[PDB]
Amino acid sequence: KKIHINAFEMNCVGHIAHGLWRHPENQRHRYTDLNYWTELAQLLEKGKFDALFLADVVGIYDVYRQSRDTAVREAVQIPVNDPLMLISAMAYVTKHLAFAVTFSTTYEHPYGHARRMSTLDHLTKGRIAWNVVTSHLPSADKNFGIKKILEHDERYDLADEYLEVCYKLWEGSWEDNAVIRDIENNIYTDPSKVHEINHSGKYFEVPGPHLCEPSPQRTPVIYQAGMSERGREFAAKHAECVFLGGKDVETLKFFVDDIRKRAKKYGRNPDHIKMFAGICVIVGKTHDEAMEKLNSFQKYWSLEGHLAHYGGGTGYDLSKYSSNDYIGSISVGEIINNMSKLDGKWFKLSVGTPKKVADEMQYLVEEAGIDGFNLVQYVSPGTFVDFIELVVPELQKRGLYRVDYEEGTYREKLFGKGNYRLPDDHIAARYRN
Numbered sequence: 329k330k331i332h333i334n335a336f337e338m339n340c341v342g343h344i345a346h347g348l349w350r351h352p353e354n355q356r357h358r359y360t361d362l363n364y365w366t367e368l369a370q371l372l373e374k375g376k377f378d379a380l381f382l383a384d385v386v387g388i389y390d391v392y393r394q395s396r397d398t399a400v401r402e403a404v405q406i407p408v409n410d411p412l413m414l415i416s417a418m419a420y421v422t423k424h425l426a427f428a429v430t431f432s433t434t435y436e437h438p439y440g441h442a443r444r445m446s447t448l449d450h451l452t453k454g455r456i457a458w459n460v461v462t463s464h465l466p467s468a469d470k471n472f473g474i475k476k477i478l479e480h481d482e483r484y485d486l487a488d489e490y491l492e493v494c495y496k497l498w499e500g501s502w503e504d505n506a507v508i509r510d511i512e513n514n515i516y517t518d519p520s521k522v523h524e525i526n527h528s529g530k531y532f533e534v535p536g537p538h539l540c541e542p543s544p545q546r547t548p549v550i551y552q553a554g555m556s557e558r559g560r561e562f563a564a565k566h567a568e569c570v571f572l573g574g575k576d577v578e579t580l581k582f583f584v585d586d587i588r589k590r591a592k593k594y595g596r597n598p599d600h601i602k603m604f605a606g607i608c609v610i611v612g613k614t615h616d617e618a619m620e621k622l623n624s625f626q627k628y629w630s631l632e633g634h635l636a637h638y639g640g641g642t643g644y645d646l647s648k649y650s651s652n653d654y655i656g657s658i659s660v661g662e663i664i665n666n667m668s669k670l671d672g673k674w675f676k677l678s679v680g681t682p683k684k685v686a687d688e689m690q691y692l693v694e695e696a697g698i699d700g701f702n703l704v705q706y707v708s709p710g711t712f713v714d715f716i717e718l719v720v721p722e723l724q725k726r727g728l729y730r731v732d733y734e735e736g737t738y739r740e741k742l743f744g745k746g747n748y749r750l751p752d753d754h755i756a757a758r759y760r761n
């Protein structure tokens with residue numbers, strides 16, 4: 329009955345609300361300060377958030393006007409630092425807050441990734457999640473010196489095998505009680521319980537064994553974000569949590585239902601997939617207070633930064649278009665006009681008092697079948713602070729949000745006490761014996 333809430337973040341300056349770094353209250357320039365991250369983690373745990381959800385890119389937004397220069401000037405996801413580096417400090421200052429890290433299957437080898445995720449699963453005591461992504465920004469393929477550039481759908485096939493490899497390492501290589509720490513017999517780990525995985529496929533050849541001992545979750549909680557038909561299929565097959573695009577009930581409900589249907593052919597119980605929507609919240613004690621914040625942020629909204637983001641995200645360079653050309657069924661003039669507005673993004677914008685925000689959140693949950701939200705920021709830390717001070721108590725009083733954390737791993741916070749490892753109906757469960 330309780331709504332899962334994640335804080336949506338990225339280790340860079342301009343993430344989603346382009347132009348806002350200028351706002352006098354903002355702290356985006358602190359992205360280089362370790363203290364920003366630990367203070368954030370502490371704030372989010374105070375607000376009982378499920379997790380900090382970190383986006384990432386290793387590509388550059390160089391589509392709009394055929395150059396990275398707009399992205400560079402407007403700080404559109406450049407500079408960007410590595411999100412995995414943040415985790416240990418944030419985990420150190422928190423007890424329950426979990427961490428979902430975006431990391432691409434397209435560039436770096438799974439054997440190194442598997443050890444990194446196992447390491448965080450140990451260090452965080454089972455509070456790590458992985459947002460599995462394929463990446464769509466061409467400068468990454470150039471900079472990792474990829475010889476054969478993979479097509480959109482083929483990137484997801486590579487991701488399938490990438491996950492196959494990680495699942496074998498995480499679930500199958502070392503048996504549950506491999507580590508015995510037996511001083512009498514001088515056996516730290518029973519060598520008969522550590523196994524090669526002997527993986528052999530189209531993209532990878534990985535004899536194994538894994539380098540790490542079994543950690544609390546073994547496999548990190550698996551997120552997916554990617555709305556293409558291939559992406560939704562990938563979600564249905566692998567994801568425990570799905571970050572969906574869409575800003576209304578009809579759209580979100582369609583996608584929730586679509587993914588749950590797709591999951592059946594893989595033998596998955598669709599209730600074993602949680603559905604997350606994006607939401608931007610601008611809240612005040614009174615409507616006028618909310619509107620005052622809205623009007624302030626609107627002043628700083630940078631159309632040019634958004635054009636750069638749109639270019640990288642869609643592949644469409646709009647500078648190359650007459651006002652009067654057509655991309656969907658929308659003129660290019662109308663695409664651009666929607667983009668200079670705060671609610672033009674593919675997330676719900678909720679503006680008003682806490683009763684209203686909560687009402688609108690509750691509506692999406694109850695009518696679209698969504699399980700949680702990734703909270704998108706307009707200002708740091710103001711959006712999160714206002715959400716925590718004003719919306720959280722309203723949600724709590726209504727039974728819609730935890731008053732305090734459940735114990736256990738992040739998977740248990742999501743799926744129930746005792747569900748610390750992937751359920752029997754997940755495909756990774758195949759590799760246990």
Ligand SMILES: Cc1cc2nc3c(=O)[nH]c(=O)nc-3n(C[C@H](O)[C@H](O)[C@H](O)COP(=O)(O)O)c2cc1C
Nearest residue numbers: 383384430461462463464553554555556559571573
């Ligand atoms: C809600 C949402 C969030 C996303 N977050 C990221 C991200 O943080 N990093 C990234 O490279 N792609 C992100 N993407 C895009 C995809 O994860 C992926 O990179 C791919 O290029 C697009 O997938 P699709 O074509 O299957 O939709 C996101 C997509 C959606 C819908």
